[PDB]
A paper describes a structure:
The crystal structure of NanE from Staphylococcus aureus, which comprises a triosephosphate isomerase barrel fold with an unusual dimeric architecture, was solved with both natural and modified substrates. NanE is essential for the growth of S. aureus in media containing N-acetylneuraminic acid as the sole carbon source and has a highly conserved active site across both Gram-positive and Gram-negative bacteria. Based on our structural and kinetic data, we propose that NanE performs its epimerization reaction using a novel proton displacement mechanism mediated by the substrate.
SaNanE crystallized with two monomers in the asymmetric unit. Unlike other TIM-barrel enzymes, dimerization between the SaNanE monomers is enabled by a C-terminal α-helix, which projects away from each barrel and packs against the neighboring monomer. The theoretical scattering profile calculated for the wildtype crystal structure of SaNanE was a good fit for the experimental scattering data (χ2 = 0.56), suggesting that the crystal structure is an accurate representation of the solution structure. In general, the active-site residues map to regions of the protein that have low temperature factors, as evidenced by an overlay of active-site residues on the temperature factor plot for each chain in the asymmetric unit. In the apo structure, two active-site residues have side-chain moieties with significantly perturbed pKa values: Lys63 has a predicted pKa of 8.0, considerably lower than the pKa for lysine in water (10.4), whereas Glu180 has a predicted pKa of 7.1, which is considerably higher than the pKa for glutamic acid in water (4.5).
Author numbering:
A (entry chain A), B (entry chain B): 1 to 222
The structure:
Amino acid sequence: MLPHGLIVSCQALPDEPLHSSFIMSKMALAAYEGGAVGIRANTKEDILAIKETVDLPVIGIVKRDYDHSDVFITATSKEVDELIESQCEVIALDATLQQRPKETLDELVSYIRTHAPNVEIMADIATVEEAKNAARLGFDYIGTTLHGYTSYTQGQLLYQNDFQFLKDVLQSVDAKVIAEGNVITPDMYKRVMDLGVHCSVVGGAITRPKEITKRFVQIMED
Amino acid sequence: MLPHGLIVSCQALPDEPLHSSFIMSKMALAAYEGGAVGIRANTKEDILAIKETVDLPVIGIVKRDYDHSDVFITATSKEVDELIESQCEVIALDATLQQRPKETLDELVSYIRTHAPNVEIMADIATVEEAKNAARLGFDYIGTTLHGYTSYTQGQLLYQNDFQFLKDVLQSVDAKVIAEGNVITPDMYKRVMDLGVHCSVVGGAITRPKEITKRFVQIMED
Ligand SMILES: [Cl-]
Ligand SMILES: [Cl-]
């Protein structure tokens, strides 16, 4: 199981400065030495590289665009198969009811339970009712990952109105909730943990120096 | 580093019914599936078996009796060398002021820091002054393991006077404190965590069916 505490997302997509399975493995080692209790990683190759540097539990995803689908976080059984091969402790996937390229959410959950019975599953959701649906499907973890990053939640951010969306998710499900998306400061991390999330995923604020640099530069431009 | 939460001690000495590297590896798997954040294990053979079964961090010891010494938890460099080979994340040793068979406590600490710099060390102590001495030697974790199990702490037990000893250890050192020794109920586990220990080690109450059986039988004999 994932402990209580800080999960560090070690991701760099193509054309990002730190894009490299090797570099993400070193970012994961840094997070481990810093006192992270887990890693979130993208693609089989990054996950396998990370598993050579740290023994921390890994939340695995495959970000891959499909034609005629807005679902890109572990969209089909192809991505699930890669993550089963990766041996990541948790498989995370988009858990919205948006049109998928192949299998439905229900079919992907069943597929993982059948072919990988020792792996836990995490629902990346954008709405309270998506979180409720994920809890009903028996997801081990429910993340706020896609809140503000779907066409129907545009302009919304996790921290808005003292984390009201997170408070609503926590009240609606008894499953372990993960604060993920726009946790950019230790103060924000403390708040979501005090509100009663199981753990919190921090990415950009630790592993995206471009994003951190922009925050420093922006204070002078206000 | 060790997360916050429950560490399960999976030990069975030669005289015990479950004495087996294989059985202790399955006890460790059971602990992992139950939501343990770490394992405490005894001997290289048990540790290697556990570390091929689960990726949980392992606190390694070697219990071995020596002539003309009351120190038996990782007594000499021989035991330290076995634990270095085991690749356990944390090396625990008796951190009492008691004379050791070969190297002193101070010598063994220096030995581990030199020969295994990526390994954390845990002090099994009996007294507040031993906890303070462990902090002086730069121990990563300080456990209450030997409190009541030395010639100079006879009649003392961790839970006595609402864990007064644990309270005294916690306010004496800034290092991460581990509640270990006679933590035998969830109620005790909750209490020591509420008092602000980093984590707690539970052994016999989970992994010694003989000791659990005795507690069931004893309620009818009072
Ligand atoms: Cl970056
Ligand atoms: Cl037993």
